[PDB]
Amino acid sequence: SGFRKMAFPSGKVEGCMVQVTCGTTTLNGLWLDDVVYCPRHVICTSEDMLNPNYEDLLIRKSNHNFLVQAGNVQLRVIGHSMQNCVLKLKVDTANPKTPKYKFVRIQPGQTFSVLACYNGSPSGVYQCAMRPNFTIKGSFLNGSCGSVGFNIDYDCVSFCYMHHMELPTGVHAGTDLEGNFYGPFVDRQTAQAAGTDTTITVNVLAWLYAAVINGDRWFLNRFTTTLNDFNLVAMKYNYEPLTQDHVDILGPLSAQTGIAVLDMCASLKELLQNGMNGRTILGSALLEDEFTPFDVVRQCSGVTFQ
Amino acid sequence: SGFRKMAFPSGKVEGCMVQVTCGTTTLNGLWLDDVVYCPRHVICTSEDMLNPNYEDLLIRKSNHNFLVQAGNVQLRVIGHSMQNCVLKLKVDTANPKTPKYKFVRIQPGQTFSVLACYNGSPSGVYQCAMRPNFTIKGSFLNGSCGSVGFNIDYDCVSFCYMHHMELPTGVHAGTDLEGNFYGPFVDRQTAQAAGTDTTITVNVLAWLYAAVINGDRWFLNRFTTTLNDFNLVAMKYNYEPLTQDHVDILGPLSAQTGIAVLDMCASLKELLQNGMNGRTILGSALLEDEFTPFDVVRQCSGVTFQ
Numbered sequence: 277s278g279f280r281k282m283a284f285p286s287g288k289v290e291g292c293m294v295q296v297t298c299g300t301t302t303l304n305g306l307w308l309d310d311v312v313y314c315p316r317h318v319i320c321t322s323e324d325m326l327n328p329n330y331e332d333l334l335i336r337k338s339n340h341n342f343l344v345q346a347g348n349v350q351l352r353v354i355g356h357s358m359q360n361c362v363l364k365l366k367v368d369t370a371n372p373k374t375p376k377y378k379f380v381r382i383q384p385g386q387t388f389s390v391l392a393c394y395n396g397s398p399s400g401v402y403q404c405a406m407r408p409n410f411t412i413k414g415s416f417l418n419g420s421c422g423s424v425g426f427n428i429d430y431d432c433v434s435f436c437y438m439h440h441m442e443l444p445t446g447v448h449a450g451t452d453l454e455g456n457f458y459g460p461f462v463d464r465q466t467a468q469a470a471g472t473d474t475t476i477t478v479n480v481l482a483w484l485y486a487a488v489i490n491g492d493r494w495f496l497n498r499f500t501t502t503l504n505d506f507n508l509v510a511m512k513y514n515y516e517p518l519t520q521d522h523v524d525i526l527g528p529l530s531a532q533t534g535i536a537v538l539d540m541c542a543s544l545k546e547l548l549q550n551g552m553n554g555r556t557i558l559g560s561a562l563l564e565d566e567f568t569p570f571d572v573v574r575q576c577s578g579v580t581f582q
Numbered sequence: 583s584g585f586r587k588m589a590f591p592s593g594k595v596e597g598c599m600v601q602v603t604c605g606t607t608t609l610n611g612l613w614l615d616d617v618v619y620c621p622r623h624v625i626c627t628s629e630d631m632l633n634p635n636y637e638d639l640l641i642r643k644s645n646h647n648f649l650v651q652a653g654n655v656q657l658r659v660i661g662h663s664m665q666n667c668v669l670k671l672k673v674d675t676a677n678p679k680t681p682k683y684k685f686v687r688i689q690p691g692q693t694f695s696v697l698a699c700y701n702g703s704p705s706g707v708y709q710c711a712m713r714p715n716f717t718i719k720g721s722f723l724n725g726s727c728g729s730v731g732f733n734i735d736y737d738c739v740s741f742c743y744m745h746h747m748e749l750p751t752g753v754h755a756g757t758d759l760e761g762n763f764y765g766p767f768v769d770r771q772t773a774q775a776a777g778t779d780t781t782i783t784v785n786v787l788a789w790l791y792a793a794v795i796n797g798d799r800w801f802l803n804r805f806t807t808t809l810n811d812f813n814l815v816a817m818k819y820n821y822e823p824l825t826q827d828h829v830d831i832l833g834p835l836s837a838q839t840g841i842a843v844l845d846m847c848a849s850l851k852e853l854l855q856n857g858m859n860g861r862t863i864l865g866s867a868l869l870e871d872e873f874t875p876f877d878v879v880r881q882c883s884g885v886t887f888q
């Protein structure tokens with residue numbers, strides 16, 4: 277028993293982290309086979325960042341201008357190209373610790389593990405969700421750029437996120453590993469609005485199932501609701517619409533607990549309308565929306581990797 | 583900016599996890615040099631667990647009775663001994679991935695990372711605190727026994743916790759790596775009372791400093807208090823006494839923010855007496871006590887390892 281925010285084991289990603297320096301800018305790179313991937317603003321001075329011409333800047337750079345370090349060892353750069361917002365540095369050494377890997381573009385509402393790094397050295401690991409407005413609520417200081425987000429499916433690392441920038445109120449934005457931003461952001465230090473964030477309804481329901489599995493049952497009411505009536509109430513509280521796809525995805529937790537999804541929806545409607553009256557669910561005074569149905573099953577069934 | 587519950591990177595511990603089986607009981611072991619450490623109840627059937635005679639049970643066991651697997655590879659056991667509540671299995675192969683390591687006995691109020699494992703395979707990593715009543719609030723299913731808790735100081739893994747058992751309400755108890763239980767527990771399936779838990783005052787103050795560093799300043803009041811007057815108020819709310827040692831340990835956060843510890847104590851006294859009035863601190867509706875002053879500094883200064 278017990279329910280914790282749990283990250284994937286980071287060992288397979290730790291072996292891929294390097295330091296990339298170009299003049300006075302140092303940040304992190306991801307070393308897979310004979311390529312290092314890093315944010316392209318490594319080639320910027322502080323002033324460049326206000327309105328960078330990345331092509332004019334990369335044009336003046338030679339391979340030797342990129343100092344890449346894996347622990348002590350300097351890796352020699354033998355080629356460089358820009359793909360959208362990421363630099364690819366070809367190196368003369370293939371990483372011997374390259375795991376099986378994929379580049380994936382994750383969907384809003386899905387979770388991943390972040391391995392926070394400084395100067396190419398891992399600092400810590402934590403789980404976060406891609407918010408409906410394509411930001412994440414991370415922990416990132418100066419030096420963390422190039423830190424990556426990932427999921428593990430048995431032996432395969434799916435890299436989904438590379439860190440680029442911070443937005444108002446300690447929210448974070450970055451790219452997939454093809455250098456395409458999540459959301460309407462550009463890698464320039466100029467005013468840009470994030471859309472308003474919403475609550476990930478399917479994830480709150482997954483977490484209420486986790487609560488029941490753990491014996492926290494006080495919020496279960498005797499009622500049911502229709503999908504349409506549930507969605508009308510939750511829209512008022514800035515919850516995303518629940519879809520039949522979501523109902524189908526909650527199927528395993530529904531079957532394990534014997535609680536129909538629409539019955540759990542009636543219990544959530546009452547929490548939204550009446551609040552929690554000073555009670556906690558799984559130790560929390562607020563409704564949690566950063567556990568997916570698959571995260572709840574994985575954690576409540578003991579799914580392992582490697 | 584941003585503040586997350588962050589675990590240590592787990593790579594150095596992942597390389598040490600093995601599976602240990604003796605008849606029908608399988609759980610996890612820690613493989614360091616040519617020794618595997620695991621909970622001694624691996625030698626128990628379900629019935630044995632009600633009142634085990636570990637010596638009578640281990641007496642009937644030969645080296646071959648222990649099946650140890652590191653991934654696919656079977657490791658041959660060449661010796662076995664019991665030290666308090668842990669079995670030490672001598673194996674004919676020293677682990678090539680053994681990191682620099684220490685066995686430490688952590689103090690109540692200190693945090694560590696748990697690498698949750700099933701069948702010798704890592705499942706996930708999360709941070710937790712040794713509670714004042716010598717339990718932890720973990721996430722552990724059947725099969726998780728032998729999972730370890732650790733801290734990393736640059737290159738050195740300090741192993742502090744090995745998982746043995748679950749207590750009423752999904753709280754967890756285990757041993758140091760010399761097999762001595764934290765708290766008044768024995769490895770028997772019979773009634774045992776945990777002492778009442780308390781709130782780790784020094785950790786709540788550390789977290790209020792993290793909030794200020796992140797710009798969440800609404801709870802700062804214009805007052806100060808004495809250590810004695812603070813302790814009289816907090817004792818009512820089941821907070822542990824704050825000591826001068828604690829005041830000294832909060833020194834770095836106090837100096838960084840320019841807020842005297844006793845001024846922050848006056849702000850905590852007002853939160854305890856009046857509550858939060860529906861406001862959040864760092865996204866939480868409750869006061870958090872599982873970040874140490876060192877965890878706040880580490881996370882807010884970007885301390886790395888390896």
Ligand SMILES: *[C@](O)(C(N)=O)[C@H](C[C@@H]1CCNC1=O)NC(=O)[C@@H]1[C@@H]2[C@H](CN1C(=O)[C@@H](NC(=O)NC(C)(C)C)C(C)(C)C)C2(C)C
Binds near residue numbers: 462463468
């Ligand atoms: C990254 O470059 C690194 N070296 O770590 C850094 C990471 C930042 C620093 C603070 N926390 C982080 O996550 N990224 C940047 O400095 C990027 C970089 C330049 C500005 N920038 C920002 O993150 C800024 N944000 C920003 O301007 N936000 C807007 C106004 C667009 C909403 C700032 C102010 C430094 C946090 C570029 C190329 C985007």
Ligand SMILES: *[C@](O)(C(N)=O)[C@H](C[C@@H]1CCNC1=O)NC(=O)[C@@H]1[C@@H]2[C@H](CN1C(=O)[C@@H](NC(=O)NC(C)(C)C)C(C)(C)C)C2(C)C
Binds near residue numbers: 725727750
């Ligand atoms: C561990 O053996 C494993 N194989 O994973 C297992 C871990 C447990 C199972 C559920 N969650 C966990 O953390 N440990 C045990 O089964 C230990 C073992 C036998 C009983 N036991 C327990 O944890 C029990 N707890 C218990 O009896 N609690 C008291 C009454 C002492 C407060 C139980 C009921 C199975 C959870 C021994 C030797 C202690």
Ligand SMILES: [Cl-]
Binds near residue numbers: 562865
């Ligand atoms: Cl909360």
